[PDB]
């Protein structure tokens, strides 16, 4: 229910994204998706310098235009390693989004570091037991609404930080609290299912 007015500012958005992604570790991939409805944008400074800075920062930028192809956006996507697309219709937009859901292939410059992660259990405290210590969730503390005093939940093995949502990286020690199903949820990408051979029914003399 917002109001659509003015003109897009690609330079400011890219600068803000780079500032946010400046502190991110190198091994983590930096991916940018841009929805460009208008064909013209206003940049307070030269965008090519920002393009060079993004290239040095190893950030992938993909642009899906709506009206037509933009030469500047195409060059930016090519230099950043991303893909530029143009929307044909709603079905084409959905297909492009589904294609962009899959992780992009890792480039040569992609780092390979052994990151350490913790997998806490769902610690649930019973009021019958004397060891029931209700505590507000750290994530729920961030909201203006009063956090719910939960009897149990997930406690960080590294600093005993309490979180009620997973997979959420621990804010205190920076540890990424994940679960075994979460890790296995991307295993299908590791072993993609190859397309089966298509032989017409008439030419196939076998089981019906």
């Amino acid at each position: 229910d917002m109001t659509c007015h003015g003109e897009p500012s690609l330079y400011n958005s890219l600068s803000i994204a780079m500032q946010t992604l400046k502190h991110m570790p190198g091994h983590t991939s930096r991916e940018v998706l841009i929805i460009f409805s208008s064909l013209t944008t206003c940049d307070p400074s030269n965008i090519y310098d920002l393009i060079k800075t993004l290239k040095a920062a190893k950030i992938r930028v993909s642009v899906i235009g709506l009206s037509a192809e933009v030469r500047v956006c195409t060059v930016l996507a090519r230099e950043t390693g991303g893909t530029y697309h143009v929307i044909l219709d709603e079905s084409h937009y959905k297909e492009l989004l589904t294609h962009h859901v899959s992780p992009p292939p890792a480039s040569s410059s992609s780092e390979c570091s052994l990151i350490r992660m913790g997998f806490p259990q769902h610690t649930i405290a019973s009021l019958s037991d004397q060891d029931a210590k209700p505590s507000f969730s750290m994530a729920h503390l961030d909201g203006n609404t009063e956090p719910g005093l939960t009897l149990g939940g997930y406690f960080c093995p590294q600093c005993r930080a309490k979180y009620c949502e997973l997979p959420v990286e621990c804010k205190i020690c920076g540890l990424t609290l994940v679960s075994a199903p979460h890790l296995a949820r991307s295993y299908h990408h590791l072993f993609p299912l190859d397309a089966f051979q298509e032989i017409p029914l008439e030419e196939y003399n076998g089981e019906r």
Binding site: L39, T40, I47, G65
Partner: protein, 760 residues
Amino acid sequence: MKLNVDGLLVYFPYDYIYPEQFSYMRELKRTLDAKGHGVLEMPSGTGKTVSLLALIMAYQRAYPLEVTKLIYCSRTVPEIEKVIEELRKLLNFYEKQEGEKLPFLGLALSSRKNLCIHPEVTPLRFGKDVDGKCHSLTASYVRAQYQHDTSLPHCRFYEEFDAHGREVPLPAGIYNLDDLKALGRRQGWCPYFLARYSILHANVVVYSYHYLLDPKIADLVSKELARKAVVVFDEAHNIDNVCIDSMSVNLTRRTLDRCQGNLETLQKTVLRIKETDEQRLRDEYRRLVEGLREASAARETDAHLANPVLPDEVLQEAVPGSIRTAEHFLGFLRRLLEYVKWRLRVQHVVQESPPAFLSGLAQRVCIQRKPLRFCAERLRSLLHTLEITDLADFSPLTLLANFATLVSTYAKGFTIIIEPFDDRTPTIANPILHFSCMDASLAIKPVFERFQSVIITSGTLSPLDIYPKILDFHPVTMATFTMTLARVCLCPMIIGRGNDQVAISSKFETREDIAVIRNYGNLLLEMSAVVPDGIVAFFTSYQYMESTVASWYEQGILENIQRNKLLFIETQDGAETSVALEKYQEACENGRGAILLSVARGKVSEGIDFVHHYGRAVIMFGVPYVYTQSRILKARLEYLRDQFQIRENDFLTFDAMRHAAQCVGRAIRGKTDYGLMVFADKRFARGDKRGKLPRWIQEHLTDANLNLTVDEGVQVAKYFLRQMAQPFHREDQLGLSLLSLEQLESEETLKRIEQIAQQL
């Protein structure tokens, strides 16, 4: 890549070749087998130049005798630079393929303005000033005196070339204008004189139309050209206009005043030198009476004011004794100038034939044709014998002498038009005489009769029969190469109806219509709001464009257009026009929409090329018919009708369609380049007018897009942009629009290539 074209090996510098390129190579080889002139039509952006250069190099390697030297004629300096770069890349590919540097020498020729290094002549803003200063610093009489006096003015660049540059010719290779300047600076020589000296040695010589088509400049190149040389003309769709302009003479009242002043100064100088030394006049008289061959053939450096326009037969005859005396010829020139001014005093426009004007001059001024025939020779001798350095101030006298010589010898195909009032401002006394030439073929007549063959190609060659009539010759081959595309890169559309269903037309009666202007403004606004940044709009005339822009601003529609995309409008001044074009290109490369509004006769339509992101949308506002009020155009149309049975309306339509195709045909650079073509006029729907479009463009002109509206055009543009902006792979072009090495060997592919091209 190696190509076998009718048993001839071609070293293609790219890994793939278009089928149209193979057909062009085959047809060019067939034409070369006949040693005759030929006309071929090839779509722009198809790499025709690369194929032509490769085939010429293959022919030279196989048979140097058949093509002793290649001649390339172009339009602008950037074209020469691009040709030099492409030929250098091809030579590098040849050297890599063969492992050795071939003994191949290529050279580009330009004026002294683009080849001067002297610091004093550098800041000059005009080539004529540069030429005059160079002549003053490199005069033959000045050089001889400077030999005994170093303090005298001189140019070391030419002197060192004369002393050192003549013995050692340039090594085999290809050099650019900047490369030539750098070599001259390194060696202390002038690249202009060194290039002129090395023309006879260069296997390929590339220059512009003016350096050879102009008879005044023809001998500066043709003297070192043999009969077996092959001449190439690219984008020569307006060669007739260039020849007419070269053969046309314009005189004004200010020109007459300057001529009178320079004649008075010349008479004073003659009197002064005669008082100082009368022997020079006697020596000049002896030279003239004994023969003009002695002076012309012994000083090749005095070619500053060469006049090779007259046929070689007239050169043998000497100047009549009545005007051999310097004072007699000065009085003759004074009487001629007075008669010309008196004739120009007429308060109405006078149309005359050269024979009638010559007869009138003979009756009044007692001037026979024979003494006036040698006007240029006597003027050249007088200017050479007086050691005149600042010849720039003497230009009007030379122009008048050349005009008189043209009248005295050339009669058929010329018209003298005397207009004392400007067409734009008849209230202003502007007495102007036009010696308009209606026979451009004469300017190309010796070229057909001297060289082995002439190559003519252009992207706007819709009628294949008018050019043989225009140039008065019979080309051996007249073939148009149809363009085959795996992906439709062009969407030409015609919009003769506005939003309010107003009949869109560009006739001068309807040019002042407010409704047409408002419809054009709405169309431009929608195009800016829809089509990408690259927008170019070609109008019909400068005044019409200015009125349309003013009406758009007053209505306020142009304000929203500026809100969508930045607006750049060219002016008459080319200096600020270049800045505007640079700003437009920068904005298009900065992601902000830039819109250009030019005229079909402006500089943009002449020598400006658009990249894929620059030629996204080209819109022609009506058929660019030439302003008929020019009596020169009417006289040319009458002469063409009386000499070639060509209707004036047909010629005007052909010229307008050629201009439109030139404006729009530069928006495509290849298969990967796609652009939008819009023709906002109902007149384009006419069968005669529509049929005068290039075949590679007319074929893609779908009848479903004929005479659409603004909304329909916008929808079609959206569909075309969305379809053609999808990612594409060059592998898809294989077998359909692109041929690999293996695909060439297929006989079915060869049959398809043969079927692609058609001869007429």
